[PDB]
Amino acid sequence: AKMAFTLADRVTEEMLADKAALVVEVVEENYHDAPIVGIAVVNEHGRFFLRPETALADPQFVAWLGDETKKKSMFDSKRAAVALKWKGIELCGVSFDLLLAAYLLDPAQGVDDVAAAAKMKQYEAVRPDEAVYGKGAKRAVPDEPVLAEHLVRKAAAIWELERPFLDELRRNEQDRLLVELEQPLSSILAEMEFAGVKVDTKRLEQMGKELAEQLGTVEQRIYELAGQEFNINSPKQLGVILFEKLQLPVLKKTKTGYSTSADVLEKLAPYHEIVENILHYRQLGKLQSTYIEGLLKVVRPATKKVHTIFNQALTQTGRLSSTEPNLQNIPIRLEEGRKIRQAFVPSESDWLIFAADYSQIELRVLAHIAEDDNLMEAFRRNYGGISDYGLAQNLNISRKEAAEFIERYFESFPGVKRYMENIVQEAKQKGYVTTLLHRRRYLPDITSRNFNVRSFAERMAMNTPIQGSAADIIKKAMIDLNARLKEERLQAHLLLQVHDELILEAPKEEMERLCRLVPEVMEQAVTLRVPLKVDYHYGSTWYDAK
DNA sequence: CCTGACTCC
DNA sequence: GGAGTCAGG
């Protein structure tokens, strides 16, 4: 563990080389408007640590950051790019991202620091972040020399690991997936996160006021029907009321007690009317706790914007996730919750929300992969590997009839059935399954002698190529769309992605254009054996974009 | 801190 | 099948 570096007082010319590993350290998990605590640069000329108060107010260093011809290798470049946006500084020329590289090589490793990626190539001259900063209430930036060494060591690790990682991606035929898809997408996501979505707090607060009143009413009705006050939000207490006091049938148990899941309670409706009120209550309570209160807590008060973080290197299938707040699970199914969407508005006057969604993309993908003629044919002119039991329990119907449904289904679509058998066998033979754009998922459990473990792995083999291919497609669609927007000099920009949906905002005058441009780009992102179809709507709020 | 609830794709 | 947040405990 011996590594020389320069703890620099000012920026020098040799730090501004046209190829470098760069670390712009943001310690807080949520990097929006978060402090940059230190900077490290490793290049042909040496290793350098820089104070941010120094470097970020240096016109030549800012210049170098924003020069796309000066190439930087980094880890989680979106974190840096966004943290720098909040400092009023543009980051360009990121040519390698070790986080995304590690993610593509094996999503299951859960790589989320440089040390964890270095471990994939037995590189151990760098520490885990948690070891340096500590955890929870003990989390702290260490003394300068200790911080400086850690940052340089992370930069030095990125410097050395780039080629070994690119080399393995290439051998996997995933180099283009990184360089032409994930990396360009990262910059697009950074733009969306920094832009944020404006919220109508006056409307959200009034909705919360009315919701609190309604909750109270439902709450009292529940106590009356139960004959007792209890905590409805405690499955344990609720279980005692339903299955002991009221002696309702026990349909299901988990490891901690009686189940009170929505499925179960719906099945108990013929026994007592309290179960319908309880379901209603728990829906309203989630609206209040999460989509009123939890959302207001994360609104930036001066601008009324919420800024999500799209985790690009988390899910096992290639999807994004969205955190703090999650803007990919805003209610829509019930009118009561859907009204939440009225609080999501355009960031400027006389702008509108535009939403476009793929129709049944996973089913069209399956049609392509399996080359099922009947399914391909139907599309030219159901999501349930569900069993006869789950189907019966889902439709509240006969398990015998459910069995017959699945049987008939595979009769009609023998190509899908063939595919399901073949992809499982391939997974056992190779140890992983792959998506259209060569994303991979390893399935080491697929030959377990244990039935449950093996079965779950086989269902991943069936689902991951379909769900992951759909993720591939929409990611490419975002990249294509961005370019087309910039080419035509539209003011419209992306705000959100919701798996198979893109949400933008734009001047009212641009709807006519987007109505043609967005769907076309999305549909032409890849060419399958069946067509892609996209639906679209625009409005004064997210609610009205329907 | 985990579990089981609601929310979306 | 893939996710995140919340209250309760």
Layout of helices and strands:
Blueprint: E1 6-7, E2 19-26, E3 36-43, E4 46-50, H1 52-55, H2 59-66, E5 71-74, H3 77-86, E6 94-97, H4 98-105, H5 114-118, H6 129-133, H7 144-171, H8 175-195, E7 197-199, H9 201-226, H10 235-245, E8 253-254, E9 257-258, H11 262-267, H12 274-298, E10 305-306, E11 309-311, E12 321-323, H13 335-338, E13 344-345, E14 351-358, H14 361-370, H15 373-380, H16 388-395, H17 399-412, H18 414-430, E15 432-434, E16 440-442, H19 451-487, E17 493-497, E18 501-507, H20 511-523, E19 534-539
Parallel strand pairs: 1-4, 2-5, 5-6
Antiparallel strand pairs: 2-3, 3-4, 7-10, 7-13, 8-9, 11-12, 14-18, 14-19, 15-16, 17-18
The structure holds a DNA duplex (9 and 9 nucleotides).
Pick out its properties.
monomer, 546 residues, alpha+beta, Nucleotidyltransferase, domain 5, Taq DNA Polymerase, Chain T, domain 4, Alpha-Beta Plaits, 4 domains, 4-stranded antiparallel beta sheet, 49% helix, 15% strand, DNA-binding, DNA polymerase I, EC 2.7.7.7
Shape: globular
Q: Tell how many strands the DSSP assignment holds.
A: 19
The largest beta-sheet arranges its strands as 1-4-3-2-5-6
Query: Rg from C-alpha positions?
Result: 26 Å
Q: What is the fold-level CATH name, i.e. the topology of the largest domain? A: Nucleotidyltransferase, domain 5
Q: Would you identify the CATH H-level superfamily of the largest domain? A: Ribonuclease H-like superfamily/Ribonuclease H
Binding site for Mg(2+) 3: 358, 500
Protein name: DNA polymerase I
Binding site for Mn(2+) 3: 358, 500
Binding site for Mg(2+) 4: 500
